[PDB]
Amino acid sequence: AVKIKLTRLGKIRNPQYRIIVADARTRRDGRAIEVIGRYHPKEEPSLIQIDSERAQYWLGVGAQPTEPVLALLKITGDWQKFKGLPGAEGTLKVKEPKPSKLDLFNAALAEAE
Amino acid sequence: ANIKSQIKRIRTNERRRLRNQSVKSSLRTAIRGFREAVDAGDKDKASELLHATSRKLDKAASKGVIHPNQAANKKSALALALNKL
Amino acid sequence: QKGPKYTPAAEKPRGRRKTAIGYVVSDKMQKTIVVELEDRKSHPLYGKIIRTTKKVKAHDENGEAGIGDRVSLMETRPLSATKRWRLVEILEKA
Amino acid sequence: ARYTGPATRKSRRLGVDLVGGDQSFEKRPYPPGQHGRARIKESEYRQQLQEKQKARFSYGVMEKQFRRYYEEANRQPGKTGDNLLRILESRLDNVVYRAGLARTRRMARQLVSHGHFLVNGVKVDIPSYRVSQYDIIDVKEKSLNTLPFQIARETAGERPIPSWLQVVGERQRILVHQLPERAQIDVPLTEQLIVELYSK
RNA sequence: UUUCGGGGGUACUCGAGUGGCGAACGGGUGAGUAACACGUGGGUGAUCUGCCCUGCACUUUGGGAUAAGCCUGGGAAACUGGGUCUAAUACCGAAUACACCCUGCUGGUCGCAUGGCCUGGUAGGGGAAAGCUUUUGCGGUGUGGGAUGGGCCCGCGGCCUAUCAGCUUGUUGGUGGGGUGAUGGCCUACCAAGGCGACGACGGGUAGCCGGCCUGAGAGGGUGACCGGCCACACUGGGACUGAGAUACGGCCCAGACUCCUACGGGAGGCAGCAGUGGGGAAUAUUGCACAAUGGGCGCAAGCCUGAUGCAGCGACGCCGC
Questions:
Q1: Distance in angstroms (rounded) separating the CA atoms of residues A28 and A5
Q2: What domains appear along chain C, each with residue ranges and CATH number?
Q3: C-alpha to C-alpha distance for D131 and D113, rounded to whole angstroms
Q4: Residue C72: closest CA among C15, C24, C31
Q5: Ramachandran region of residue C34, left (φ > 0), alpha (ψ -120 to 50) or beta?
Q6: Is the Cβ–Cβ distance between D169 and A112 less than 8 Å?
Q7: Lesser CB count within 10 Å: N end or C end of chain C?
Q8: Do the chains contact at A108 and D133, CB–CB below 8 Å?
Q9: Rounded to an integer, what distance in angstroms lies between the CA atom of residue C13 and that of residue C15?
Q10: Where is this cross-link: Isoglutamyl lysine isopeptide (Lys-Gln) (interchain with Q-Cter in protein Pup) (chain C)?
Q11: Cβ neighbourhood burial of C41 (10 Å; 0-12, 13-18, 19+)
Q12: Contact: D134, A109; criterion CB under 8 Å
């Protein structure tokens, strides 16, 4: 059975994962058929990217997500779109962008004068 | 020898081997009888011997004792041997 | 409402088997001829173009190919040990 | 590690003043030790090495760090000399010193290492920290009233603040417009000699 | 329910047992191997694929046992014999299937020759299944198509040695058989006398291969530690069995060496898994913590297992920073 797993990357303290499609018999860090997203739980909103069409294709041929990957697929709405139960709603909480350094630079300059 | 599942599998593999051996011996006997009948040169006894042997062959293929391709090869060979005679 | 009871397979284009042109150097075998294939690569270090020769064994049913004829071959599944080519036709006799 | 021994020794040996306003170097501008008066043999290697020692004892950078800096500067698509000079100038302690907030580079390094500063809203105590464009370096509120910053904030008439830096706040904020170019660096010595030495 | 010795029921639950799935992955090592082992690119009209996804059709009918239990025997032990008794999704007979397999005739079509395709048509023969559970309910069989994982064949590429010039007799080709998932001297009977080699066969030595790593201006040279892929092996040497899949590390059989038990009749074992011990050496670590995260196996699930893994301990061993 081909499965949609999470392989581990990053250094010791900070695990950063890749959402890979691979056979269930291969090791965690083995060769991957495809890479269809990444997942970084160390961030405050825990960035999640999933390539929707490839995920749809791999679910269509019958890949089985693991529990963390199933949770992620529900969050991004891909799982619901594949099934069709509540609709395809994006529940993804994207990280709030940080203002530019130039904005703060001019703000400080204006605050000086 | 050290793990419970291994000992259980020893027993179960032995029993499976006994069953498979019986089925294969029966198939070999049927083939041998049919070959002897064809060697004799008479058609009718060869005919329903071929029928019974083909039935035994694909019935053993269903049991999983032999691969379906093997049953197909054996049936084709026997039928061609009869047809040639 | 019901799905079809038969699902035709998705068609797959056929592959391209390797072909070669060579000279017959031996026909002492039944249905078998030995062909001489020449390759011209470049030296990996010194850059000069080097001509190398290689022998393959082809299969011709009727044995219409004599020694010295430019014949054409096409690859095939192993017909015996060492036999992997099939004679297509004789380009020019000699 | 760090170099803690006498500072005047290096100035005397290298033939130039590195602190900037030291009287001992003027009193005796010759190398230290018993044989500080002997004539020297001339060698290109000696001149290149002394230039490198000048560079890395002005900024207080050890040899391994200096070699890393040279590799980084050579790798960059500019030219090696000014790339190395700009990398050296972009250090946090050097920025603090050139900002008029420290009398000497050593005390700037000491202040930075003690975490008296704060870059971009987050405490930084790393003298080797490199400063990028539009960087705001601030003194944390607790240490604003300390005597070092006091005498730094009431003697703002010393060495001019270079163009690429600008103190904007009465609390002595520092703004970095862009990384300095070779024209505005205003440093002793010759970068070409260092480049020649490190290609040997 | 009780005499406090306990006795019955339950099925919440569960030792042992039958049954299923897993155990072929994961983890280790680099001995062998100069080879289609590896890298790269193809071919398979010459092929298999459990679990997973998705169409279609089914899930009919009958039977005989046996583990466990109980009684009893042998043996030092390992272990084992007999009698009686019981269940199944264990095992077995038949019906149906005509989607499938085989055979004969026959049509069209595409070729890259054997041939392939149109589930072509047509005549004959034939091939299965299993129930459980009231709760998000799980299952069984055949067959079409996907997906994954393979197998086999081939071009090219990467060591040193003629103070190693001849080598080969299933060896080279054919035919008929056999065998295999599959082609093929893979095996076999007969027939023919071929096949390879100075473009280095046949011998000898050394060696796991690669992405990469180090060096160098580059070309090149050296290398294959960590991490990642493939191969090979699991005390030594052979062999098959079960299975969708086996070099079967913690399976089986035999032979051997070694270590241990023995009532001398006979038995047991395999750290190149994680720690650890002895030895060799210039030299290389803890008989640690946790399934909290990721991956895996079984289970409807809760859950269970996981020295994989995530961490910690030790060593300036290295890089980086102070």
A1: 8
A2: 2-94 (2.40.50.140)
A3: 15
A4: C24
A5: beta
A6: yes
A7: N
A8: no
A9: 7
A10: 93
A11: exposed
A12: no
- Please give the span between the terminal C-alpha atoms of chain C, in angstroms, as a whole number: 69
| Pairing of the two strands A2-10 and A64-65 | parallel
Q: Would the CB atoms of A109 and D168 count as touching at under 8 Å?
A: yes
User: A72 is written with which tokens?
Assistant: 């992620």
In the three-class reduction of DSSP (H, G, I as helix; E, B as strand; rest coil), residue A37 is classed as strand
Q: Say which residues have a Cβ less than 8 Å from residue D43's Cβ, sequence separation at least 6.
A: none
Which H/E stretch holds residue A5? strand A2-10
Pairing of strands D122-123, C83-92: unpaired
| Residue A38 lies in domain | 1-95
DSSP 3-state of D58? helix
Q: Interface partners of C (3+ CB pairs, < 8 Å)?
A: none
Here the tokens at position A111 are 């605050």
Q: Tokens 């054996």 belong to which residue?
A: B74
D4 vs chain A: nearest CA distance in angstroms? 36
Q: What is the dihedral of CA D183, D185, D191, D194, to 10 degrees?
A: -160
Q: Within 10 A of A66 (CB to CB), how many other CB atoms are there? A: 14
Q: What are phi and psi of D25, to 5 degrees?
A: -65, -40
Q: Which residues of A touch D136 (CB under 8 A)?
A: 104-105, 108
Question: Which domains are present in chain B?
Answer: 1-85 (1.20.58.110)
